[PDB]
C-alpha cells in the first residue's frame, strides 16, 4: 500500500488523444512522516503523515511534543496510511505516475436532515389523483401484529452526507510534481477545500 494526504482543489477537463477527460485536481504533497507504527510497538504497520503547515501559536504543548520527537514543523492535519512504509521521511506526489489507478477518500457533502426521497431514492406519493399530504412520504414501514415492530436498518429520513466516502479505481491522469498536483479522472467526494486521502488502488 501507499498513500498521501491532500486537499481537493476543483474540477476541469483536459484533452488527451482528442478526448475530453473530466478531472479533479488534488493538491497532495508534501507530507512529512511524523510517526511510524510498528508491529513490535503498535501491533500493526503504518505511517502517520502530517499535512499543511500550522501557526505554532496555535499548537498546544502535548501536540508540540509529538512533532518535536519527529523533528517536524507543526502541521495542521495528522493522518495514517496503513501497511505503507516509505524509505524517506517525506511523502510527495511522485509516488504516483500517470496510468496508475488510485482510491480516493473524502468527506461527502452534507445534506443535513434528508427526506426519504433524496436519501434513499424512494418514490414518494402521487401528486394528484387524491394523494393526501403524502407526496414525499415513505409509505408503509411494516406489517401488522406479526412481527409488530420495525426492522433495524429500515431506510428512513435522517441525516445524510458529511460522512467518509471512498470511490475506487480512479485513473491518475497526470502529476505535476513542481506544484504538488494530482489529476484524477472523474469525481472525488466532498467539497473543494476538503481534505482527501489518495491511496494506491485495491482493485486488480
Amino acid at each position: 500500500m501507499k498513500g498521501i494526504l491532500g486537499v481537493k482543489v476543483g474540477m476541469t477537463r483536459i484533452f488527451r488523444d482528442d478526448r475530453a477527460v473530466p478531472v479533479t485536481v488534488i493538491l497532495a504533497g508534501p507530507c512529512p512522516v511524523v510517526q511510524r507504527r510498528t508491529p513490535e510497538k503498535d501491533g500493526y504497520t503504518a505511517v502517520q503523515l502530517g499535512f499543511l503547515p500550522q501557526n505554532p501559536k496555535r499548537v498546544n504543548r502535548p501536540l508540540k511534543g509529538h512533532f518535536a520527537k519527529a523533528g517536524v514543523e507543526p502541521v495542521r492535519i495528522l493522518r495514517e496510511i496503513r501497511d505503507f512504509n516509505p524509505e524517506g521521511d517525506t511523502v510527495t506526489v511522485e509516488i504516483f505516475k500517470p496510468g496508475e489507478r488510485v482510491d480516493v477518500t473524502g468527506t461527502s457533502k452534507g445534506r443535513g436532515f434528508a427526506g426519504v426521497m433524496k436519501r434513499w431514492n424512494f418514490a414518494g406519493g402521487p401528486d394528484s389523483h387524491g394523494a393526501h399530504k403524502i407526496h414525499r412520504h415513505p409509505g408503509s414501514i411494516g406489517n401488522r401484529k406479526t412481527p409488530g415492530r420495525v426492522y433495524k436498518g429500515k431506510k428512513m429520513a435522517g441525516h445524510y452526507g458529511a460522512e467518509r466516502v471512498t470511490v475506487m479505481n480512479l485513473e491518475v491522469v497526470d502529476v505535476i510534481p513542481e506544484e504538488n498536483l494530482l489529476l484524477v479522472k472523474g469525481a472525488v467526494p466532498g467539497p473543494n477545500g476538503g481534505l482527501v486521502i489518495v491511496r494506491e488502488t485495491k482493485k486488480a
Binding site: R13, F15, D18, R19, A20
Partner: protein, 122 residues
C-alpha cells in the same frame, strides 16, 4: 432520448410519415433510445401505396434526436426532430433513399448503408 409513446418522423421513402415507438430494443429494460438504437414502432401515419401502411409494426433505427448527444471529444450535436429509418431484421433500410442529415454515430454501430444514403453525416 426516445421512449414508448414517442413519435418519430421517418426519414426515408418507405411510405411511412410518422411512427410511434412501442419498445426500445436494447436489453431487458432500457428507458431510452438514442441515435443508433433500434426500436419497435407502430406506423401511425403513412402515404397511399407505400411499402408500409398505417398499423404495421416495424423496426427502425433512430438517426436524429432533439435531445443533444455528447461525444468523447467534448462536443455535442442536436437536431430539430426525432427521426428514424425503417429497417429489416438484418438492419438494412427498407427504403432506397434517406432524407436529412444523420448522426455519425450510426457508422460506428454498423448502419453503413444508411450513412452512405444520407445527404449529410454530422
Amino acid at each position: 432520448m426516445i421512449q414508448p409513446q414517442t413519435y418519430l418522423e421517418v426519414a426515408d421513402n418507405t411510405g411511412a410519415r410518422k411512427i410511434m415507438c412501442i419498445r426500445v430494443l436494447k436489453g431487458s429494460n432500457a428507458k431510452y433510445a438514442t441515435v443508433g438504437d433500434v426500436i419497435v414502432a407502430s406506423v401511425k401515419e403513412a402515404i397511399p401505396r407505400g411499402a408500409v401502411k398505417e398499423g404495421d409494426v416495424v423496426k427502425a433505427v433512430v438517426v436524429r434526436t432533439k435531445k443533444e448527444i455528447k461525444r468523447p471529444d467534448g462536443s455535442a450535436i442536436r437536431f430539430d426532430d426525432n427521426a428514424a429509418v425503417i429497417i429489416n431484421n438484418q438492419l438494412e433500410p427498407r427504403g432506397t433513399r434517406v432524407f436529412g442529415p444523420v448522426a455519425r454515430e450510426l457508422r460506428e454501430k454498423g448502419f453503413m448503408k444508411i450513412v452512405s444514403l444520407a445527404p449529410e453525416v454530422l
